[PDB]
Amino acid sequence: KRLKVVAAFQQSGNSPMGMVLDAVPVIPPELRPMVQLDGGRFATSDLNDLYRRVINRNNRLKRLIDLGAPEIIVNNEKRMLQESVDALFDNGRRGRPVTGPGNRPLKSLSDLLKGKQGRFRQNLLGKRVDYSGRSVIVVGPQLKLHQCGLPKLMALELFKPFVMKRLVDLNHAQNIKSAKRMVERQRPQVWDVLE
Amino acid sequence: QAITRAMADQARTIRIPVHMVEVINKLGRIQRELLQDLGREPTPEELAKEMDITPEKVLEIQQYAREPISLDQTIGDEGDSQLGDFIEDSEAVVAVDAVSFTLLQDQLQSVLDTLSEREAGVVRLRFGLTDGQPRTLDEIGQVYGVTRERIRQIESKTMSKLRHPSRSQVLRDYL
Amino acid sequence: MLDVNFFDELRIGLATAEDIRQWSYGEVKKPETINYRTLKPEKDGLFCEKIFGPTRDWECYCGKYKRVRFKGIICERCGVEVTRAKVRRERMGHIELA
Amino acid sequence: VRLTFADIELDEETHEVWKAGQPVSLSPTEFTLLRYFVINAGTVLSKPKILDHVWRYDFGGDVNVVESYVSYLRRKIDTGEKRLLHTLRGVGYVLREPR
Amino acid sequence: NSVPGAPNRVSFAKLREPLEVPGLLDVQTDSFEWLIGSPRWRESAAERGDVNPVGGLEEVLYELSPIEDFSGSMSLSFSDPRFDDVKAPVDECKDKDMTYAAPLFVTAEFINNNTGEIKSQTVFMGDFPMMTEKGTFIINGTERVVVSQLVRSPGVYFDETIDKSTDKTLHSVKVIPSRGAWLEFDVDKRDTVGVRIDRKRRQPVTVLLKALGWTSEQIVERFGFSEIMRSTLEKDNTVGTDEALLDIYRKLRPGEPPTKESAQTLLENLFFKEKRYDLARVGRYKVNKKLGLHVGEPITSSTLTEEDVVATIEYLVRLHEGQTTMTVPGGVEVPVETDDIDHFGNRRLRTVGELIQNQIRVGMSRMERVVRERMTTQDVEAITPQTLINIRPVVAAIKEFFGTSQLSQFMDQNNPLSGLTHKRRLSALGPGGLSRERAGLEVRDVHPSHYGRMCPIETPEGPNIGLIGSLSVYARVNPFGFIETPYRKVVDGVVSDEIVYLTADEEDRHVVAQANSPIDADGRFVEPRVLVRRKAGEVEYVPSSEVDYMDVSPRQMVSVATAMIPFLEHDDANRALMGANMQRQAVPLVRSEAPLVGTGMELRAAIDAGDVVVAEESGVIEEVSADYITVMHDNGTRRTYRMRKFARSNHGTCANQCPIVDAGDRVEAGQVIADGPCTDDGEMALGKNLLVAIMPWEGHNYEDAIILSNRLVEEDVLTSIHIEEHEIDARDTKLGAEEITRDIPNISDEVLADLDERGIVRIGAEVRDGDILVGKVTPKGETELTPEERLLRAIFGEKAREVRDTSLKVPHGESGKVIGIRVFSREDEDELPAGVNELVRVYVAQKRKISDGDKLAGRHGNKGVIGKILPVEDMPFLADGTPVDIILNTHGVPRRMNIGQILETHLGWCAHSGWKVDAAKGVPDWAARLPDELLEAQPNAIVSTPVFDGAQEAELQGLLSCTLPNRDGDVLVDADGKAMLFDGRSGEPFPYPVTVGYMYIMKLHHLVDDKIHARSTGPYSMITQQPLGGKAQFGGQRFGEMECWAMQAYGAAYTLQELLTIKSDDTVGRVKVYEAIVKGENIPEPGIPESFKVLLKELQSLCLNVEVLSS
């Protein structure tokens, strides 16, 4: 059991130095955004809280070490720094998970890759797509095998740019900016050009 | 003192100076102590007297005291979705206005090519079309070997011939 | 590295401190994100405009440059490079632990 | 069609202003600043916005011009120390009747 | 009947109910009265336990008092909880969206023990929300209902387990007390005992028994017969009470050094003190009853007693030994048996009173902590009760309970039935309950103890199946939270009219009999052996002289919603469940015709729903009108009833209320006055009566589809008004303010013609999708003004238009007229939120006709969308020429075990036609048991049928035999039930007869208009550039990985690539493809998805060196 890892370390040119950590990277801000929800209320990705915690712990450790402190205080601060780091990487892996308001665990980096809510299974294997819709089905006994019904409004919204180019090509609306209101007002000349 | 300084400077997601959070805390204290003495939440006007400031500043304090919310909490009654799934990216490209703008600049260049090439260059350099730098009249003169007054006359010619309704109709619809 | 859909290998390994400080576009040293009044990022904060790049397109923090003519050239006053806002999605920072 | 606020009255036709009914003449750009203010009375104006709109985009000068101008408007119309044309530090200038 | 305004509903009931159903809202009204302490509850408690008549608020206040200080020279007490009048009436409060509440006042008592001081300050505690008459709380204007929940009742629970090694029946017990530490006693694989305390898998009984101050002498005195414990006592390895105490402290509270007193005080502080462990009063009673400790002592001292641990140990050991009766020294004998966990005798009902009291208690404790903290720091003798009391935590706790707690959700009102069943329903989720994933198959079942307590039909069919249920019609809540039902008692074959109420466990000792039994008008049953239900759920035959109890009536094991289904006993459990579910989802029509065939519960349900106004006091009617009714009482004074017209419901349904009285007809107290949304003549009416053909028709009704006649469209038979509310907020911003004006930049006229000069729509102007609704002008700010704009402004003279038109656009897929404007403003001096200056709520209504795709369903669970709306010519029609109304597929009837629907159809046709049984030459044999006044009936009469005591098959056959014609001589429906129909298309008669009749059909709230969605290019999320989800935004269908599996199976690689790259993720790909199908140019190659890059960045920032290698 020990060989199946030490041999892997030996064969590769990977130094185990990185297996312990000396500096921590910071994810780009857009992936941890703070979007101002309308009404003045803000909203953050809860990673910023963990980043603030680890930055605070690091800054306090710097102050204590360069000020001159009892070893108990410095060791305790190092312990909290370690705890903040593991909470950032893996919330709730050990000890009580660090919660915020409302008594709920905070999302860590590893929490973004687990289960059906993770990046993989939710946003990479499956995705929400454009040019689509959903409706109720009814029996189509007068149709053929290859045929299928489609609601008129549903088709109109689905084939938007197609009818724009077709109607402008047919000179329905001199310009596509006009074609916007041309189709959204659902004037009668859109139906035949849609068909 | 150390604990209070830390709480003021470091415990808030949005940083607030100590002078401001002191008055925020004083407002909270006076409001929550006046609730018992009045049995009714006071409209700012009245707390303005205690703070000796205008109620507008009290309202500004109140709307500044709110804290950001989290984007991960489940907003549904049952647990199936997150709040961030309902947030629209404002900076995202609508992909229709950009295409519209491409044909729009095509229409612009077609319309201006109707005008004289000298006038077309004048307006192009005037509003920064070829570049992002609109230029002063002296630059137009030195690139045309002409005085600034004649470029003023040229600009008069351009925006007069431009008002000619054939151009006006074909450019008006695109808005 | 430049992503033109010509890939033959996806290699993953341990990330030493040297690699992460090679990736980083600066060091974060302040737990501040957004000013409570101007609603703009601070200096050396979690949303550092200088480190992670400009927010507005072709704009510096101090407003010295606001036009597409400047490209790639870094402002000498605020230190913000002038480029697209997608670098805020791309660029990443790092923290030096004591 | 004339534009009014408090005691300031504007005529856009022949370019003259009324401040509670006594004559006044005023400089062109200062007139344009007052026009931009009254047309956005009830909205605060930010300095870069003003130099953008009323002032020509190629303005490469400093910023102190706008404060000199608004000082001219104050000394012309709001002679008192407290004014109807309020100032917000770093946010620009606006036309408010004081509460 | 027995109701003053009751329409005559002749019923096929065979036996008389000894009692009528109680007030169906009592499960909440009674609890709230008990919590308040109102005289209404006071008088009831005066005869049902007046030994300790105490209100819930009174109880918690007495529990907290007297709070003390550290030393004991200072003390404070609470007493006399009094309320005041409501701030505003219900309608006014709902209109201006505050919370319906009344002030709370409690007289504190500050006592200075050292010297003696009394300070009786009357302290304001807050605006306590109050329950309305309907039982619905109002918070911030909306209607909220707190649903009762089921939890494990605190107490002891002996369980038995198999070690699967030597077939040894192991035993265990779990003392599960609320707000306390768990204690587990059991027998492990060997013959020792496991006494694990706070999940520490060690410490046999020896250490605890010695830690209770006992020596081995008393242990061997008590236990000489238990070989299990004697051996454990021999291998104690620990001697001395101090040794046991320190061992327990070591294995329970490590890290701190032990002393001679640390463990001694810790043991008392853990289980014998009320500050860290206190099973509730119900828990104490449960322990007493189970162990037989106390039987005639007032309930007090909720903390655990020393006798309890010894009794539990003895009970567990004797159960392990295999005994049957255990007797504690000093208590009555009790049976020895393991305790089931799903039996209703062990599952409580935390109703609204208990939940509100618990949240009040946590707020009480928080403010008490604050009071204690201030009670020492502040100087003595300058102290008033106002100084200590901080009411913020209490109001915060109650407000946080009412909002954002799944135990208190929206009051769904799409019909009165939904409102009724939202209350009187039992949930299993929430704080202290179990989640769906936590729920095993044992919880979701139907325990035999549910009979009469909880209905086994009414249940959501989704993932919450078996967890959320509904209370029965006759059930009642006992004072301790146990669900209690009444039952008749029988002696020596004589049933008295004495009605006793029994809990779940009480039914074990007795024997309950059949609900419908052959009573001989003296109580004796013709045969001795009668189907009865025994203790353990076994149903066997028992001689008549042996049974001691018999059920109150049929439909006692049923719920109110599922008591409206006629011929319930003929329907399968699954289809009955489904039909009960769609009963709540019916929408209010514009006529709401009473069903031709129904059950007697409809009238009572309509009256008790609360949305049908009932004349509280009798008298003549002074004047009647659409908007108001004024009744002239018998004594001088009058009463006026303000009516509600087109009031928007919580689910976008109308709430019309039309009066049904005349100008001068005397009315009686308790009589219906005006019908509700789904009521007519004071009884339930959720649908309409329609002609039915059970034949298949050209496949347009294939696979549960339905085809309706366009007459229903023309005659407005099936049409429902839908009120929609749109909100706009005009807040404060560093742009200044948002004005509600008409100065919107760049607008035409034909769109602005129907909008008044005040910034809103004219009342009564039709709008559709995309139209401007409220003009909220906003200063645009400044950004990069395009150079092209600068050129453009000189060609038409357009001004800058410095304001962004942030107006109200009517969203897609809705239209209709405008009802009215409710405008709020700070200038109007209203309590708008901070920064918000104006609030405008516009109401839009449209008349939604029936159309294909709308879901229709009967009461037997037959669902389906509308296959086709075809004209009246194209339908089968009888020899009378009456076109059929609805058509159902025959294949769905036998394959779904819902045979009751055709029975209802036959009965409906009989009621529609009428009958005159020819009892001239003696009464017919089938009609002999059939009651009087039923042999004669008028056309379009109304009949009733109780769910289990209803019309039999022979009675239906007899009714079908006599089917007197309408106007001519024509018996269209023959004796067997079928009828002759001619095709409306070809015109030839169908070769075989088809059954016809009238069935009740209701529209469901699953209209196709609210479920149609399409999206070309909408918004995208922040983190990933994928589109959003849901009809509220532009949406965009989700393409899950299972669909990707089918994509791969076909091998259509390019289609999957486009779907995952350019229709979802790649921004540059998105704009490029849009440009492609506007320029008519070929669609370019997909790029690199952005979500993959974002994943790469998370991996890179997670300290994982990840690099993509070109070669």
Ligand SMILES: [Zn+2]
């Ligand atoms: Zn700069």
